[PDB]
């Protein structure tokens, strides 16, 4: 239960809705409510590249490092891809007839998932001219979050304001199963535990709770209570035995992933927390979070 948290870099900006770490460069991507996106080198504290993408909120953003791209989704309904070395706009298309909430990138195949207020998840194939390969229908409210299972990325999970998580197989039209979460104000976020020892998933809700699920038994393993307003996200750390959550209550919380009790609450001072990223290979155990008033990168 020993934590050593250091602030690596924090900067003020307009509301950060999406955030992501580059796997091999010391960079973080932020996507802003103002329509701007920024790539920061958090070691030198200098901007790599920034773009005014649109005038609408950009809620979702990811690196596709193996292609030197970022991919972003915005309230103008569009997915756009930029080469971060040249700034080339690679593609720009309407993906859904409504807001894009979340984007996920497959770890090996040229697949992107987008989740939308249009009640659907859509699968795009960038090696087939960004074709719409499949639409997953079944949710009954905004799809807030999509995530591939890192241990079996032929499957993915979607978290929805309809109070469910659905787990799907690529190429199949109905969910493999639906978790009725009992989080009655909806699911804002879903994440997979990344290691082989536990088949766990985690959900965050406006109902102030975080729940841990065993995806083989479909049972709720634990409920984490303590946040004082909407919980924006909750994730498992890739190297440390912790869960990190963030909330409109303005805090990040670090929870023990064995006992499911809170270990530390951080009052970041940037008002509401919206998004989170962890460094994929645990470099310096970095995490980053985006808030109303900027972002912070912390080493643990």
């Amino acid at each position: 239960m020993k934590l050593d948290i250091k602030k690596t870099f924090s900067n003020r900006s307009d509301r950060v809705k999406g955030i992501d770490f580059h796997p091999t460069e010391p960079w973080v991507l932020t996507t802003l409510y103002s329509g701007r996106v920024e790539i920061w080198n958090y070691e030198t504290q200098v901007e790599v590249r920034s773009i005014q993408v649109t005038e609408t909120p950009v809620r979702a953003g990811k690196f596709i490092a193996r292609k030197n791209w970022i991919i972003v989704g915005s309230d103008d309904f569009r997915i756009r891809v930029f080469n971060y070395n040249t700034g080339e706009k690679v593609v720009d298309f309407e993906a859904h007839p409504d807001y894009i909430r979340s984007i996920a990138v497959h770890p090996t195949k040229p697949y992107v998932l987008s989740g939308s207020d249009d009640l659907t998840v859509k699968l795009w194939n960038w090696e087939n001219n960004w074709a719409l390969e499949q639409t997953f229908e079944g949710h009954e409210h905004f799809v807030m979050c999509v995530a591939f299972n890192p241990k079996d990325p032929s499957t993915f999970a979607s978290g929805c304001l309809d109070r469910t998580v659905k787990v799907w197989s690529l190429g199949q039209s109905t969910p493999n199963f639906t978790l009725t979460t009992g989080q009655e104000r909806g699911v804002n976020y879903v994440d997979y535990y990344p290691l082989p020892d536990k088949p766990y998933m985690i959900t965050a809700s406006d109902d102030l709770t975080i729940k841990i699920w065993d995806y083989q038994t479909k049972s709720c393993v634990a409920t984490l209570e303590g946040h004082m307003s909407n919980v924006s996200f909750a994730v498992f750390h890739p190297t440390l035995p912790i869960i990190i959550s963030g909330s409109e209550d303005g805090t990040l919380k670090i929870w023990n992933s064995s006992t499911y009790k809170v270990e530390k609450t951080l009052n970041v001072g940037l008002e509401r927390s919206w998004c989170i990223a962890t460094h994929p290979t645990g470099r310096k155990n970095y995490i980053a979070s985006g808030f109303d008033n900027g972002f912070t990168v912390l080493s643990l």
């Binding site: 905004f142 807030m144 304001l161 509401r272």
Partner: peptide, 5 residues
């Protein structure tokens, strides 16, 4: 109008 922020 849900989740506009």
């Amino acid at each position: 109008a849900r989740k506009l922020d």
